[PDB]
Amino acid sequence: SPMYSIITPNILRLESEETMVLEAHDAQGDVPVTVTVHDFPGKKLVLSSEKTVLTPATNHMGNVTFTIPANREFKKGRNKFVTVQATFGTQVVEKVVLVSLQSGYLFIQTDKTIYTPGSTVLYRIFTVNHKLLPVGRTVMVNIENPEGIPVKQDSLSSQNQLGVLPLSWDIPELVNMGQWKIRAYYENSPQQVFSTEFEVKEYVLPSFEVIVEPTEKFYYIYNEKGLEVTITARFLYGKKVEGTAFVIFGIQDGEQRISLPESLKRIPIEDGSGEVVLSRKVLLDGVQNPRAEDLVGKSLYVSATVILHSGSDMVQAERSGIPIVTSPYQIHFTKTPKYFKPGMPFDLMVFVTNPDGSPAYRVPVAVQGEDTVQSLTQGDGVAKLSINTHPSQKPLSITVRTKKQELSEAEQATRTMQALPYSTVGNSNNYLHLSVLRTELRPGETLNVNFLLRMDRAHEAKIRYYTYLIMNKGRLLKAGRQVREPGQDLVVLPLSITTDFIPSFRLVAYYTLIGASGQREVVADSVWVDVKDSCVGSLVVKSGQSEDRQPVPGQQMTLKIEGDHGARVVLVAVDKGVFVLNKKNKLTQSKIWDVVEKADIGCTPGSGKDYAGVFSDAGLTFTSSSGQQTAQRAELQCPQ
Amino acid sequence: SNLDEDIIAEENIVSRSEFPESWLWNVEDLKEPPKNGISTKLMNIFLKDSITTWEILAVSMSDKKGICVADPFEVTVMQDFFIDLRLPYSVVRNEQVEIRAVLYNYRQNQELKVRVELLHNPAFCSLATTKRRHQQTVTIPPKSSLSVPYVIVPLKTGLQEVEVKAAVYHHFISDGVRKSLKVVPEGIRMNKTVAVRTLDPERLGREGVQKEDIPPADLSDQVPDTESETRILLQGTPVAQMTEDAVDAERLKHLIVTPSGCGEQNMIGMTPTVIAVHYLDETEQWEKFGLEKRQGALELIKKGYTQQLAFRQPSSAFAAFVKRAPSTWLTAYVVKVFSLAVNLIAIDSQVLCGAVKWLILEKQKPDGVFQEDAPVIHQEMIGGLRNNNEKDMALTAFVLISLQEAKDICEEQVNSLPGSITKAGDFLEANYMNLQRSYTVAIAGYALAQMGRLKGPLLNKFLTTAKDKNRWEDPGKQLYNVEATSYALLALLQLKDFDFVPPVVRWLNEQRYYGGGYGSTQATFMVFQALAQYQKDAPDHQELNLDVSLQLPSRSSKITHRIHWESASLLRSEETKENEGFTVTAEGKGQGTLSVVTMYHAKAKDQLTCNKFDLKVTIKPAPETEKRPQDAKNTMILEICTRYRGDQDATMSILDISMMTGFAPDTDDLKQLANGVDRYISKYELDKAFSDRNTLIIYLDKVSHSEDDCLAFKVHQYFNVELIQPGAVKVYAYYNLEESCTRFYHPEKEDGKLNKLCRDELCRCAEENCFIQKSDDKVTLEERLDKACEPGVDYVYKTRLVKVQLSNDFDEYIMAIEQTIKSGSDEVQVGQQRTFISPIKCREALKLEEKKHYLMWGLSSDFWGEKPNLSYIIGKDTWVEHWPEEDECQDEENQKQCQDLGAFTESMVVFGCPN
Amino acid sequence: XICVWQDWGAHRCI
Ligand SMILES: [Ca+2]
Ligand SMILES: [N]
């Protein structure tokens, strides 16, 4: 008897293209499929209707694509649902799916980070859908005073605007100082509010910049030299500062800031630079001489005030969050699946960082004990470690340590995680393991995805293909078939990586077989794969001249803009003195991808406690005509 | 003139002035044909005047490729020699400040001799005049900078400009900076809320209008001649509704049951499952329940419906058993249940409307009553109909409610339905007033409300029957009162009597009756039908259209802010600055808030300056050295005393000292200070020759909070200049530049203050506008006449000097008007006296002696004061000429002047001015 | 090295 199945994201978004993957397993001939979407539970209105035919030519696998529109039934903050119902010939397969009201992204750029009373705020709102492509929709824009009360409201459509909405607001001369806010949201998605802040303050631009950096990104609690810091002072036009610096340190304990008055030093700034040390004794004396170990996990901060020898200008800068550590590194398992397949390799994706959170390059890591597998971190701080697992339900405890040649054992980082065994259907011992090389992956490259099969050999030969699905930006980007021929425990899919895969993707794969008496068994796995962040296209601004010298005031100059054909480019020029006073809330591509990554509907690095958990944790529903399906997803946000 | 200097002239310097913090807010489309899939656009820009690094940011949007934020691109704009004019954000009118023009020489192996000048501006008082700018010559070593102090006094509020220029001897380069700063009055900003009133015309309004008039504020403490504003803000409350909680989903789990039994018991089982799904659907509570369980509950409902069909007789009626005579009540109850389930499963219209038709055609009497000829045997499933007097009323109402529930599906199939409903309603309406039991009042009340016939006395009977305005109750099983109150709630919702429903829904919820079990059929069905309709009919929110007509007087009538519920949180309200009356008239539903805060500048009781540091600075002559040389070195002692105004000593602090022009500190004194407990002077600054020694910073490790810390050192005059600018001392702690104190010093100016003329809050500079000495030998009669007839010349006088008054500020010459030769603004009579004012700076050029006579003419722009105290300023355009007496005219040395002055008077008086 | 515990296949554990 044929088993029909449908796979959708387990959070559906309105006004955005969603793909439903349809398969007729062990069916013959052409299978017509009608897919409809109704509101739950009323099922009165038809929200979407699409049809297709599954043929032997396409191996009885296809899809429909459709777009649930913004309706009156949607938008007291209760979760909304739709009923997705696929009819294969006459057999109905139904799944109730959670709906997200949020319909895209808004990004807000202000011309500057800080403003005086009596000046104008220039700002733009970029209106994109979930694929980051420009859309024309209606947005509400608010400007909020520091008390959080909207002073100005606007309603604009970005139709025929290429997703760019230029706006402005005049700051009155009599105004409250502090953090102002621009808030924007799509008209159809009022729950999702996008924001940026700008400061309103009385200031003049400084003539130079002060940079305060410790010689290491941490303070090692047994370093008897104390914490050494370099003070750099340079005029905005690049020349070195001559002057005097006042440097004072403090220790941060949670939210408590404790100044160290005995650390205050006055030093000369000669040729733009100076050095100052917080001594270990002054640090420990300053917190009433506990043992030094009690400071581990706290952080240090440094304030530097630089005065020009003329005394005609002054600039203060602070560096905070310098961790007090016993180790230069820390190990994270956030990218490693928390489930393993007993009897199969278990792959660890170890993330090593410096104490500031930046990735650590060329750090040796190794699994404690067993086969002594040892790897080196890439430029993205990631290293892959593979261990064999025995066929037992015994939970897997794994400890990873750094093996940095230059460090003592006490200074090496360590971290332990636990992985639980994937639970099989009917204690069948049938599994699937996906594997990938974890080197840094670029668009245009090919990624070999390994499909590894664990199945007893009497049943083995029945598995002739795997279905795989690629999730990206919370949609189904791609779905296909990976063939298999009997006796092949390992087959390889050559996955060509394109800019469509930025910033990361999930590959979900499953096979299905028939136990005798008709019982259907579904076996699934999944992996998460990072793609190096870049723009989908590209954009560069550079000089269109030869840099024989720096320009003089009023000089004409040619700007060279290199980008995608037909792109709309919007510009701003800002005096870097502005950023000496405030450098927060600037738009960057790294921030855009971070927003995209927070919004992922997949929630784990891969695998799951069972086939249903594999699908759900990667952001997918699975529903079959013979009853195999994912559980309801409880919340719009990922568990914690 | 003749002076020839190897330097660019001031007239040929155009100052830099375009210093935006951001620019290039531009949009460009990459239309060029792509080469490597990359389209290139060449864009010509003109860099601003700032000497800085610009950070250029591009963002691109593409239909195929989305959004891309480029890496920042930097352009450093730079120059070998330039001024950095460091102006504050703002300065207070009439308060003296020091600013610094910082001169940079980035030539690597070249020292620059530089002349720097502050430009005259009538908005400021400085040492610059319209005759000569305040100029200074300095020497800047290579790879170095020099800070040139200028002392200025802002004279008028608003955006004003300071301009400094500089040129280099023997190298023809130059720079100028024209930079703006805000001049503000001495009054501190003050917000004084005068009144805050709420607006609700439909709540606190008497005749449908809310009047809230507020008088204007006095603002007695406001500084004179300063602008004030009045901010009247409007914020409405988007109003919402108070809805009683739904019954929690977990309480309905036990209502999902499997039906079984014969024709009556099967409906006992079907009842809780149907009404539970009905309630969970309407209250949108399936998520708490578990969504995929709704499918199973629908299946159980279909099973109950399918099983009930085995007891459908040929007549389309129903009984417990196929051979039992059909029941009127049971057939109507099947209609009641099936009708509510038509959206849940497939209900055959032939079954539903067949039962409806049978009831009408077989069991409705001619007078409209529905009659039971075969009572059900489960007497506990009929609720309050059991053991009920008033049976005709109660059963007729029960059946009619079922017919109404099926009317929309069955109207088209059952011709008799409209007339049957009318006839049954006629019977109920005719007998409603004689009803005694609350249960019958409620069930028939609902039936009559469905037909719009619960009005007048019947409506009053229905309402007043309730006990405590929240329940319909009879003595007996409490289940009957739950079922009766549910019927009444449905009747209240039918009437849309929404003010009456809250206590009723509360009493039902407080009952915490969750249905199910023996005898629970009607109470279970009715309580959840009634509580579901409550949530369905509940208003989501209350309405806000506060149409407040708030046009202040003298503002005519424009578009006023409509909060309109949607924009109620928005505060935007354009306001008038001038304080005026407030006339509030509110009309509309909802509620909002209104506040009136007044803006203005108010004078503080004492200084806002030097709040954290005391600073006292003196300058005095140094005594005779024991070396006893020629001692041509004019030497003074500068003493600086400072104290911190806090509970503990200040930590590291700064004394930023500027020299009087041409003075430099005594190096041995500095070395003595630099070697000392608590004080530091950098080696960079101890070893410098002059053309760097105009500035000095002394670093203090601490400043006492308990007493003055004092230091002193000698300063030597290495260069006479004509105008010695006052020096200045600024003290502050390193961690807060704002909390500073600045004092000035000068051997000849009170408190180092530039001389100015101030009455109330207007000041004019008294370091300028000096009388111009003119020799007697050159001036002809024609030239005096031609000058004195210029329109700008307001007055021409022959005077006698009665009284001279020399002070260190202004000299006063109380002058007697002996002849009004030309009258102007001041209608002075002959013999009256007038006071003529001249600043001390101008003293050399004025040769005035008591008792002597003078010819004087001047400009109206040199008047000072008002009519009772109207004095004359002697300025650059004032003519002052000694008038020789008659007795002196015989002297040959006086012949020309006596001839000129006599003829000048005669011509001016007899013939007047031409044209 | 890396392998799978089962009786069949090129990558089975020995
Ligand atoms: Ca990425
Ligand atoms: N093995």
Side-chain angles (χ1 to χ4, degrees), chain B residues 673-692:
Chain B
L673 291 168
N675 284 94
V677 287
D678 314 326
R679 304 197 176 115
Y680 168 74
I681 304 191
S682 66
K683 190 265 185 178
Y684 172 104
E685 186 156 326
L686 281 174
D687 60 28
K688 290 287 183 165
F690 322 129
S691 294
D692 190 26

Side-chain angles (χ1 to χ4, degrees), chain A residues 78 111-112 117 203 236 244 312 535 557-559 561 563 566 568-576 589, chain B residues 21-23 26 28-30 39 41 43-45 52-53 55 57 59 61 68-69 74 147 182 284 699:
Chain A
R78 286 149 159 286
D111 68 294
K112 290 187 294 142
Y203 64 84
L236 301 171
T244 302
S312 305
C535 290
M557 165 180 209
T558 294
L559 270 188
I561 307 148
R568 165 150 294 168
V569 185
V570 295
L571 302 156
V572 70
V574 184
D575 193 321
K576 286 204 85 193
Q589 194 67 21
Chain B
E21 289 178 19
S22 65
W23 58 292
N26 283 62
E28 303 288 355
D29 296 307
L30 298 172
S39 282
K41 170 141 184 51
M43 194 178 152
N44 285 325
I45 71 181
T52 193
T53 298
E55 181 184 277
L57 178 68
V59 187
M61 194 67 100
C68 178
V69 180
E74 296 196 344
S147 187
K182 298 178 183 182
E284 299 222 337
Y699 295 101

Side-chain angles (χ1 to χ4, degrees), chain A residues 501-504 528-534 593 597:
Chain A
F501 289 67
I502 304 174
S504 64
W528 177 86
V529 185
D530 205 359
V531 179
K532 201 212 157 71
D533 285 0
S534 75
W593 292 128
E597 285 289 13

Side-chain angles (χ1 to χ4, degrees), chain B residues 382-451:
Chain B
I382 65 176
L385 261 70
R386 181 184 197 166
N387 297 321
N388 206 323
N389 298 95
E390 306 164 353
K391 176 71 189 313
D392 285 347
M393 281 296 271
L395 178 58
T396 298
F398 174 88
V399 176
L400 173 53
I401 289 157
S402 288
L403 300 192
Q404 291 274 31
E405 189 178 320
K407 175 211 290 174
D408 275 357
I409 293 90
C410 290
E411 218 185 356
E412 97 197 50
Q413 320 198 14
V414 189
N415 274 352
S416 48
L417 191 52
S420 165
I421 284 160
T422 293
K423 273 190 261 202
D426 289 347
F427 171 76
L428 295 174
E429 182 187 8
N431 301 281
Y432 194 77
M433 290 300 321
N434 299 311
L435 288 179
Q436 300 278 272
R437 297 183 61 103
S438 298
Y439 176 95
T440 318
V441 160
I443 190 171
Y446 180 41
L448 290 168
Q450 277 175 156
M451 315 178 57

Side-chain angles (χ1 to χ4, degrees), chain B residues 625-734:
Chain B
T625 49
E626 307 292 331
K627 295 172 278 274
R628 288 282 208 277
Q630 94 278 18
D631 211 349
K633 306 288 101 175
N634 185 31
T635 305
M636 308 192 93
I637 294 176
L638 173 65
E639 182 161 63
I640 300 166
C641 290
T642 185
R643 176 186 179 171
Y644 189 63
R645 312 169 54 95
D647 285 356
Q648 298 295 306
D649 290 355
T651 42
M652 284 174 178
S653 300
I654 292 89
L655 286 174
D656 186 341
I657 300 153
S658 64
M659 295 281 106
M660 314 177 282
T661 313
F663 285 78
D666 180 276
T667 62
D668 282 357
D669 281 358
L670 292 200
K671 285 181 160 36
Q672 271 270 306
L673 291 168
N675 284 94
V677 287
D678 314 326
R679 304 197 176 115
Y680 168 74
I681 304 191
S682 66
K683 190 265 185 178
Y684 172 104
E685 186 156 326
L686 281 174
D687 60 28
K688 290 287 183 165
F690 322 129
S691 294
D692 190 26
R693 291 309 269 253
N694 67 335
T695 290
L696 167 77
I697 295 168
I698 303 182
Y699 295 101
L700 307 176
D701 284 343
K702 60 89 182 176
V703 182
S704 171
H705 84 277
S706 310
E707 80 257 6
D708 282 330
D709 287 333
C710 294
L711 58 87
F713 55 92
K714 299 190 283 303
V715 293
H716 306 283
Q717 190 182 43
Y718 65 87
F719 190 46
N720 278 111
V721 302
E722 191 80 18
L723 309 190
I724 301 172
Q725 183 176 258
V729 183
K730 186 187 188 178
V731 65
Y732 55 94
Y734 79 92

